[PDB]
A paper describes a structure:
The flexibility inherent in these regions is consistent with their relatively high average crystallographic main chain B factor values in comparison with the rest of the protein (for our high resolution structures an average of 62 Å2 in BC, DE, GH, and JK loops versus 31 Å2 over the entire molecule). Given that the DE and JK loops map to regions in EphA2 and EphB2 crystal structures (Himanen et al., 2001), which move upon binding to their respective ephrin ligands, their flexibility may be of direct functional relevance. While ephrins generally exhibit a low degree of structural variance between different bound forms, structural analysis of [name] reveals distinct structural differences between unbound [name] and its ephrinA2 (1.7 Å rmsd over 166 equivalent Cα atoms)- and ephrinB2 (2.3 Å rmsd over 168 equivalent Cα atoms)-bound states. Most notable are the structural changes that occur to the DEEphA4 and JKEphA4 loops; regions which we identify above as having a high degree of flexibility in unbound [name]. The structural differences between the two available apo LBD structures of [name] and the divergence in conformational changes that occur upon ephrinB2 and ephrinA2 binding are consistent with the [name] receptor maintaining a high degree of structural plasticity in its DEEphA4 and JKEphA4 ephrin binding loops. Other EphA receptor structures, including the apo and ephrinA2-bound [name] structures, on the other hand, are more distantly related to B class Eph receptors. However, inspection of the EphA2 unbound structures deposited by the Structural Genomics Consortium (Toronto) indicates that for these crystal structures the primary EphA2 ligand binding loops (JK and DE loops) are partially disordered or are in conformational states quite different to their bound forms.
The [name] tyrosine kinase cell surface receptor regulates an array of physiological processes and is the only currently known class A Eph receptor that binds both A and B class ephrins with high affinity. Eph receptors are type 1 membrane proteins with an N-terminal extracellular region consisting of a ligand binding domain (LBD), a cysteine rich region, and two fibronectin type III domains. We have solved the crystal structure of the [name] ligand binding domain alone and in complex with (1) ephrinB2 and (2) ephrinA2. Structural analyses, drawing on previously reported Eph receptor structures, show that [name] in isolation and in complex with ephrinA2 resembles other class A Eph receptors but on binding ephrinB2 assumes structural hallmarks of the class B Eph receptors. This interactive plasticity reveals [name] as a structural chameleon, able to adopt both A and B class Eph receptor conformations, and thus provides a molecular basis for EphA-type cross-class reactivity.
Numbering used by the authors: 27 to 61, 63 to 158, 161 to 209
C-alpha cells in the first residue's frame, strides 16, 4: 500500500528537540504556548525592527532510510509587516529553508556555506484559523531529491520576520501499488 512515511515529526518528539540555534540567544528561541490549555512547543523569532538579521535554526540529523525524495511540511505563523509599528525598512515576510546531506549523524559545527537553499517560504493559500488569540496557522510544503547520503540536516534562516514554527514534519511517499 501507499502513503506518507514520517522521518521526523517535531510535534510528536518526546523530550528535547536537539535543534541548534545560531545565534544561541536573541534569535530563534524555543517558546511554549498554551493551547485546550496544554503547553505546546514552538520556535520563535521576531527581530523585525533590526537590520542585518541572519538567524539560523537547524534540526538534528534526520535519516533518509531508503527514500530519495523527501517532503518538508512546515506549519507556522507569520506577522504582516504592515501590522507592526516602527519596522519600516527591516521587517520581512518570508523565511528560507535549507538542507545539508551527511553520512555523519552527530555533526557539531556546520558552516552556513554547507547548506543548500530549497526555497523561500511565505504565507500563501493554505492556512487554518485556530488557538487567548486566534492564530492564522499557515502550512507550506517543499520537497528535495534525489538524496544520496545516509541522512541530512534541515535549517531555517530568518532574515527579519516575525515567525513562530509550530510544526515541522519530514516524510517520504511509499508507492507499493496493489496487484489486481
Amino acid at each position: 500500500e501507499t502513503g506518507e512515511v514520517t522521518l521526523l515529526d517535531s510535534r510528536s518528539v518526546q523530550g528535547e528537540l536537539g535543534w541548534i540555534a545560531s545565534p544561541l540567544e536573541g534569535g530563534w528561541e524555543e517558546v511554549s504556548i498554551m493551547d485546550k490549555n496544554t503547553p505546546i512547543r514552538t520556535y520563535q523569532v521576531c527581530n523585525v525592527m533590526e537590520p542585518s538579521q541572519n538567524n539560523w535554526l537547524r534540526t538534528d540529523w534526520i535519516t533518509r532510510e531508503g527514500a530519495q525524495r523527501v517532503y518538508i511540511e512546515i506549519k507556522f505563523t507569520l506577522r504582516d509587516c504592515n501590522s507592526l509599528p516602527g519596522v519600516m525598512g527591516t521587517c520581512k515576510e518570508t523565511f528560507n529553508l535549507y538542507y545539508y546531506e551527511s553520512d555523519n549523524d552527530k555533526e557539531r559545527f556546520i558552516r552556513e556555506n554547507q547548506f543548500v537553499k530549497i526555497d523561500t517560504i511565505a504565507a500563501d493559500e493554505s492556512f487554518t484559523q485556530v488557538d487567548d488569540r486566534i492564530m492564522k496557522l499557515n502550512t507550506e510544503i517543499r520537497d528535495v531529491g534525489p538524496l544520496s547520503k545516509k541522512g541530512f540536516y534541515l535549517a531555517f534562516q530568518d532574515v527579519g520576520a516575525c515567525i513562530a514554527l509550530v510544526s515541522v514534519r519530514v516524510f517520504y511517499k511509499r508507492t507499493k501499488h496493489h496487484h489486481h
